[PDB]
Amino acid sequence: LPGTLPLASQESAVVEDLLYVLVGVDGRYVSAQPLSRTFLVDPNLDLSIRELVHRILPVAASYSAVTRFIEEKSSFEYGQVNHALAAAMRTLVKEHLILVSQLEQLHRQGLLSLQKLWFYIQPAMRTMDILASLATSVDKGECLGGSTLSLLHDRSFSYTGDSQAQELCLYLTKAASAPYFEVLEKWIYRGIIHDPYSEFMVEEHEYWDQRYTIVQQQIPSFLQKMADKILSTGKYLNVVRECGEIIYTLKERAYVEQIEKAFNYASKVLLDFLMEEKELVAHLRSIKRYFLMDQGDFFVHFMDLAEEELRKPVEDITPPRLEALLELALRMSTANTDPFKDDLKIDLMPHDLISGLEAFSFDYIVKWPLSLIINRKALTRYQMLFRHMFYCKHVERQLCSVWISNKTFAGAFTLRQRMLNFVQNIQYYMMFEVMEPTWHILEKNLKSASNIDDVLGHHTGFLDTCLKDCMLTLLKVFSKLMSVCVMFTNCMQKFFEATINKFDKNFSAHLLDLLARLSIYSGMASVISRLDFNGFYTE
Amino acid sequence: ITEAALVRDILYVFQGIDNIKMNCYKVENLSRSLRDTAVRLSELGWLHNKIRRYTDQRSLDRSFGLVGQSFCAALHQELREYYRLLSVLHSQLQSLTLRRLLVWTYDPKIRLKTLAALVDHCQGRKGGELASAVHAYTKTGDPYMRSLVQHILSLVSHPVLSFLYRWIYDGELEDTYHEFFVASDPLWHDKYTLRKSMIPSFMTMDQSRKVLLIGKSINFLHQVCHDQTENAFQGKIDAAYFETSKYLLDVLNKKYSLLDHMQAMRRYLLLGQGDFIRHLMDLLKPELVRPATTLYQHNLTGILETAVRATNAQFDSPEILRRLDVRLLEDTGWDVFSLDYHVDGPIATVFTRECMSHYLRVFNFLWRAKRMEYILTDIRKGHMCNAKLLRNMPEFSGVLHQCHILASEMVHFIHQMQYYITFEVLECSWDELWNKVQQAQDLDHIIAAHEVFLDTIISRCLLDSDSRALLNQLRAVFDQIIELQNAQDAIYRAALEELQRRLQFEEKKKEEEEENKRIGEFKESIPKMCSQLRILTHFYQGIVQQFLVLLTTDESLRFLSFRLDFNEHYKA
Closest CB from A48, A113, A521 relative to B12: A48
CA A501, distance to chain mean position in Å, is 60
* DSSP for B198-252, written as a single string: S--TTS-TTTHHHHHHHHHHHHHHHTTTT-----HHHHHHHHHHHHHHHHHHHHH
Nearest to B458 by CA among B441, B471, B474: B471
As a whole number of angstroms, the distance between CA A347 and CA A361 comes to 6
B contacts of A519 (beta carbons < 8 Å): 296, 298-299
Q: Are A409 and A497 in contact (CB under 8 A)?
A: yes
SS3 content of chain B, % helix, strand, coil (to 5): 65, 0, 35
A35–chain B Cβ distance below 8 A for any pair:
no
CA distance, residue A529 to nearest chain B CA (Å):
10
List, in order, residues 6 or more apart from A289 with CB less than 8 Å away: A295, A298, A335, A338
Closest CB from A8, A48, A525 relative to B9: A48
A contacts of B11 (beta carbons < 8 Å): 115
* DSSP for A410-439, written as a single string: -SSHHHHHHHHHHHTTTHHHHHHTTTHHHH
What distances in angstroms separate CA A104 from CA A18, A41, A119, A250, one per listed residue?
11, 20, 15, 39
Q: Are A402 and A493 in contact (CB under 8 A)?
A: yes
Which residue is closest to A154 within chain B, CA to CA?
Answer: B176
Closest CB from A122, A165, A520 relative to B80: A122
As a whole number of angstroms, the distance between CA A536 and CA A508 comes to 12
B12/A113 Cβ within 8 A: no
Phi, psi angle pair for A334, to nearest 5°: -95, 5
Q: Are B345 and B257 in contact (CB under 8 A)?
A: no
A519/B296 Cβ within 8 A: yes
Q: Are A15 and A107 in contact (CB under 8 A)?
A: yes
Bridge partners (DSSP) listed for residue B327: B338
Annotated domain spans of chain A: 2-143, 178-275, 279-368
CA distance, residue B12 to nearest chain A CA (Å):
7
Q: Please report the sign of the dihedral spanned by the C-alpha atoms of residue A273, residue A277, residue A278, residue A279.
A: positive
As a whole number of angstroms, the distance between CA B468 and CA A50 comes to 90
A51–chain B Cβ distance below 8 A for any pair:
yes
B155/A161 Cβ within 8 A: yes
DSSP state of A3: G
Q: What count of other Cβ atoms lies within 10 Å of the Cβ of residue A98?
A: 9
A535–chain B Cβ distance below 8 A for any pair:
no
CA distance, residue B250 to nearest chain A CA (Å):
25
Bridge partners (DSSP) listed for residue A9: none
What distances in angstroms separate CA B408 from CA B2, B197, B372, B412, B560, one per listed residue?
125, 69, 14, 6, 19
Q: Are B437 and B259 in contact (CB under 8 A)?
A: yes
Q: Are B37 and B10 in contact (CB under 8 A)?
A: no
Q: Are A214 and A201 in contact (CB under 8 A)?
A: yes
As a whole number of angstroms, the distance between CA B155 and CA A219 comes to 34
- Amino acid sitting at position A348: L
Q: Where are the extended beta strands (E) located within B417-469?
A: none
Q: Are B216 and B192 in contact (CB under 8 A)?
A: yes
B contacts of A8 (beta carbons < 8 Å): 8
- Amino acid sitting at position A55: R
As a whole number of angstroms, the distance between CA B427 and CA A13 comes to 99
Which residue is closest to B10 within chain A, CA to CA?
Answer: A48
Q: What count of other Cβ atoms lies within 10 Å of the Cβ of residue A427?
A: 15
As a whole number of angstroms, the distance between CA B463 and CA B469 comes to 10
Q: Report how many Cβ contacts below 8 Å link chain A to chain B.
A: 60
Phi, psi angle pair for A55, to nearest 5°: -85, -20
| Stated resolution in angstroms | 3.8
B contacts of A56 (beta carbons < 8 Å): none
B301/A525 Cβ within 8 A: yes
Q: Are B186 and B193 in contact (CB under 8 A)?
A: no
CA distance, residue B66 to nearest chain A CA (Å):
7
